[PDB]
């Protein structure tokens, strides 16, 4: 079956989180967890926590057997980007975007 | 932006 796990309003850019998520796609959840464990990205921390969450949801609400699991679907959507302000030289004010993203992982019993 | 920085002077093409 397909058990979902979402981190919505993830405090980081989708450009980066998906950059890291393109690793663990279709990879069995074990080697996926390990790749993420030794991948050196804040986005890797984030997607690893979401994947743990998906595994727990699968083996508590929707069944069991971590071993028979794959990360079939994983995608990172843009989230509501916070519009801050950043004052630059000569009275000109930028707009620094405290971006975010909507990470979503789907583990499958295949 | 209520402040509007002046433009730098153009090259004097006289």
């Amino acid at each position: 079956m397909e058990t979902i796990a979402k981190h919505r309003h993830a405090r980081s850019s989708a450009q980066k989180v998906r950059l890291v998520a393109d690793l663990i796609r279709g990879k069995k959840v074990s080697q996926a967890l390990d790749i993420l464990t030794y991948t050196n990205k804040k986005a890797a921390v984030l997607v690893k926590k979401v994947l743990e969450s998906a595994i727990a949801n699968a083996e508590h609400n929707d069944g069991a057997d971590i071993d028979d699991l794959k990360v079939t679907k994983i995608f990172v959507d843009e989230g509501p980007s916070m519009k801050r302000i950043m004052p630059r030289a000569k009275g000109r004010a930028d707009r620094i975007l405290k971006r975010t993203s909507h990470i979503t992982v789907v583990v499958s019993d295949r | 932006p209520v402040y509007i920085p002046r433009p730098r002077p153009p090259h004097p093409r006289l």
Partner: protein, 56 residues
Amino acid sequence: AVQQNKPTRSKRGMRRSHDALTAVTSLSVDKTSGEKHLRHHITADGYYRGRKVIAK
């Protein structure tokens, strides 16, 4: 010093075609603790090549 026309999604993805990450090929397995670690790195416990050199 700045573009004349805005680039496109095609050119953008084409630039990012290289910025993709590369997973660590294969983790090792310590002779003693049987656990996984980076090659030439001490395990999450402290074992390195089967020798508990931290225990902290």
